Amino acid sequence: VPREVEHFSRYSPSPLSMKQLLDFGSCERTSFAFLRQELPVRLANILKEIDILPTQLVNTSSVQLVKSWYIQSLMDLVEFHEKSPDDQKALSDFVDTLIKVRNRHHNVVPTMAQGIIEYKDTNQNLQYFLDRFYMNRISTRMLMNQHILIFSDSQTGNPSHIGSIDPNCDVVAVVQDAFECSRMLCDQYYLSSPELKLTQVNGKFPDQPIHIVYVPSHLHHMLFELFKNAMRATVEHQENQPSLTPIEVIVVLGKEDLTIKISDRGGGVPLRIIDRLFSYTGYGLPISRLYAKYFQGDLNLYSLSGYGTDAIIYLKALSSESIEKLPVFNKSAFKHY
Amino acid sequence: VPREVEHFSRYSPSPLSMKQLLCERTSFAFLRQELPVRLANILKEIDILPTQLVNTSSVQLVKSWYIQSLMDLVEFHEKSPDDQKALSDFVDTLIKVRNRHHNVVPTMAQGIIEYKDACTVDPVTNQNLQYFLDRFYMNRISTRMLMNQHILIFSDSQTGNPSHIGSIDPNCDVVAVVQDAFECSRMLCDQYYLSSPELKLTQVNGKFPDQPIHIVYVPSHLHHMLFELFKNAMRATVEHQLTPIEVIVVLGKEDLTIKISDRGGGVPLRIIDRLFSYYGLPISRLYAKYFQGDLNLYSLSGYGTDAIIYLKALSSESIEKLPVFNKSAFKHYQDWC
Numbered sequence: 001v002p003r004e005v006e007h008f009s010r011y012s013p014s015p016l017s018m019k020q021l022l023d024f025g026s027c028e029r030t031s032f033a034f035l036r037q038e039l040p041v042r043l044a045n046i047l048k049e050i051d052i053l054p055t056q057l058v059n060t061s062s063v064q065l066v067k068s069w070y071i072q073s074l075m076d077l078v079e080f081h082e083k084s085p086d087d088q089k090a091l092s093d094f095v096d097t098l099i100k101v102r103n104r105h106h107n108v109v110p111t112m113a114q115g116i117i118e119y120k121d122t123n124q125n126l127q128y129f130l131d132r133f134y135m136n137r138i139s140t141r142m143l144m145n146q147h148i149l150i151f152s153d154s155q156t157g158n159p160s161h162i163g164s165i166d167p168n169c170d171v172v173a174v175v176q177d178a179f180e181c182s183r184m185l186c187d188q189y190y191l192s193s194p195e196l197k198l199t200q201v202n203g204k205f206p207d208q209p210i211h212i213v214y215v216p217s218h219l220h221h222m223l224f225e226l227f228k229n230a231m232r233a234t235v236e237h238q239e240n241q242p243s244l245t246p247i248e249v250i251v252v253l254g255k256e257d258l259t260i261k262i263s264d265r266g267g268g269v270p271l272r273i274i275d276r277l278f279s280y281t282g283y284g285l286p287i288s289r290l291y292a293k294y295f296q297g298d299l300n301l302y303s304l305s306g307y308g309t310d311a312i313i314y315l316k317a318l319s320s321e322s323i324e325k326l327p328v329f330n331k332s333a334f335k336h337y
Numbered sequence: 338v339p340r341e342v343e344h345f346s347r348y349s350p351s352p353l354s355m356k357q358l359l360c361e362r363t364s365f366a367f368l369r370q371e372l373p374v375r376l377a378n379i380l381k382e383i384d385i386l387p388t389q390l391v392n393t394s395s396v397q398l399v400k401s402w403y404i405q406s407l408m409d410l411v412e413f414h415e416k417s418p419d420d421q422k423a424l425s426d427f428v429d430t431l432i433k434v435r436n437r438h439h440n441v442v443p444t445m446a447q448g449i450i451e452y453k454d455a456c457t458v459d460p461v462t463n464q465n466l467q468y469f470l471d472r473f474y475m476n477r478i479s480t481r482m483l484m485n486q487h488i489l490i491f492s493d494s495q496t497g498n499p500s501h502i503g504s505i506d507p508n509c510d511v512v513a514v515v516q517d518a519f520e521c522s523r524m525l526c527d528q529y530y531l532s533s534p535e536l537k538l539t540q541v542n543g544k545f546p547d548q549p550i551h552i553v554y555v556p557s558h559l560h561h562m563l564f565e566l567f568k569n570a571m572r573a574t575v576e577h578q579l580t581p582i583e584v585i586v587v588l589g590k591e592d593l594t595i596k597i598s599d600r601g602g603g604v605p606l607r608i609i610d611r612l613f614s615y616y617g618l619p620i621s622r623l624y625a626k627y628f629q630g631d632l633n634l635y636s637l638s639g640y641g642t643d644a645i646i647y648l649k650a651l652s653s654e655s656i657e658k659l660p661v662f663n664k665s666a667f668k669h670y671q672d673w674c
């Protein structure tokens with residue numbers, strides 16, 4: 001690989017908290033100084049893991065394209081290492097570069113997925129790599145979009161967000177939004193959709209609306225994917241029933257945790273194979289769990305085979321404890337392979 | 338260690354299925370071999386524990402009991418399976434071994450507590466201790482299972498319920514066990530708190546709709562799991578607050594699933610794993626995993642907790658999960674930011 005990839009892969013990624021990510025919007029020279037270093041490091045770390053993939057997979061035009069994109073984006077960013085953070089034109093050029101890198105990486109996920117489709121034409125090492133590859137992309141997209149959406153002139157994002165972070169994320173509203181999105185799709189596939197039976201408990205502040213610092217787009221993706229699976233299971237398991245049981249959602253805010261449990265009566269899944277739902281090929285649920293774990297949360301499924309399934313999202317209720325969960329290429333990772 | 342320990346520890350334990358457990362000469366020949374093998378494997382594993390733990394009077398007692406039991410059992414390798422008094426004496430020896438091992442669980446626990454309270458425990462050693470205790474207690478669960486099966490079936494005096502085959506109920510009324518275990522916890526709850534939550538039970542037979550839920554299982558093991566879960570659910574309900582405890586029993590094609598739900602305020606995800614560190618809850622999970630089942634908790638901090646038991650619905654797949662002291666285990670004793 002290029003010298004830059006070898007060099008920057010020697011560094012470990014530096015995870016940020018969501019609090020720190022918010023603080024970038026409270027300064028541009030500081031985000032620029034961090035990103036111009038951190039993004040090459042993260043691209044270089046995953047580029048090293050791409051090389052140890054099975055040759056039949058790494059040699060796919062898709063994977064080779066992703067590798068070429070990441071290499072070029074890495075070079076685009078290392079060009080800014082000579083510039084001074086006080087150089088206003090360098091900051092402006094840096095925003096332009098991030099936008100170019102963002103657009104270049106826009107189709108990474110489907111391109112990588114297409115690469116797996118060819119390789120297939122169960123693999124624990126591939127699951128290991130895809131968790132890391134997709135978590136790495138989630139993190140770089142997160143960082144770059146935070147800078148773009150705060151410091152660009154045209155890319156302003158949502159006015160109520162600092163970058164992509166909603167400091168007062170209305171969790172229940174995101175739930176209702178994602179449920180409608182899944183409901184619209186469910187109606188197209190079945191001409192029927194379960195209703196939502198939503199409960200909320202604010203143990204931290206009883207009877208108070210539930211807000212946390214979070215990335216609503218990530219939360220929406222997780223809930224959308226879980227609702228799609230809950231609705232599909234409900235309709236199909238009860239297709240011979242005159243009605244559909246609702247999907248029960250409870251949103252709970254605790255001292256340390258924001259918990260969302262989605263319960264369906266869609267027949268459940270045997271314990272022996274429930275993990276297959278998280279194996280790639282079918283990237284919705286695996287990516288959803290990455291999103292949950294990205295900021296020290298988690299996503300778990302507990303099924304009652306013959307009855308239904310509980311899906312539970314755990315998010316940290318404090319932004320200071322919502323720290324990036326990042327893969328690093330080192331001896332340990334090489335040993336896992 | 339004694340020669341017999343070294344010799345029999347070189348054998349790997351032979352797990353049986355519920356179906357297998359469900360001729361006195363054959364059971365005699367198997368147990369006189371298998372019980373020393375299982376005692377010898379865990380005895381060798383005791384020897385690699387930290388010296389200050391092994392030197393506690395508690396661990397020395399456990400070691401001395403296990404060694405004596407092994408020697409008692411090895412003496413029957415000189416007897417013929419066709420010797421009538423040998424079979425009869427062997428039952429009396431199992432009864433003696435069962436009495437000698439009667440206090441193993443609290444004794445080992447005392448040694449662990451004494452060691453942790455008095456000595457420094459590195460993170461790896463602490464993880465190794467939970468690993469060892471899971472394996473030590475599973476080992477005991479398995480030797481007690483096998484010994485009791487032989488005693489209950491072949492003893493002239495210590496025969497169990499005639500409706501059961503040893504300790505196994507070939508048509509275990511799961512719901513009946515759930516109700517009984519709930520009342521046992523309820524009686525204890527009333528005595529300490531002067532009040533107890535009610536039971537709201539539901540059952541769904543997905544394998545045989547509208548039919549009673551029965552599987553081949555050890556009702557005593559199932560009772561232990563549910564009793565401990567009910568104790569924690571009732572303790573959490575009364576202390577946090579009474580909302581009832583909701584239980585749903587589901588029979589699927591492959592799984593028998595029991596979900597217990599309380600509203601006792603839940604537990605933060607950061608520390609919920611500590612509930613399974615080292616004894617009722619971790620041993621309860623061992624019981625569930627003993628025949629390839631499982632026991633998980635997923636809590637909504639600020640609201641309540643769900644506890645779910647998974648049991649194999651088929652006796653052929655209900656196979657002992659036995660620890661073995663081989664190179665892989667000794668390796669366990671010896672990637673992400």
Ligand SMILES: O=C1Cc2ccccc2N1
Nearest residue numbers: 226229230233266309311
């Ligand atoms: O049957 C199912 C499978 C699944 C995955 C994720 C969420 C809900 C469900 N329900």
Ligand SMILES: O=C1Cc2ccccc2N1
Nearest residue numbers: 566569570573603642644
């Ligand atoms: O709060 C809690 C803790 C616990 C452990 C086991 C079962 C139920 C519960 N509830």
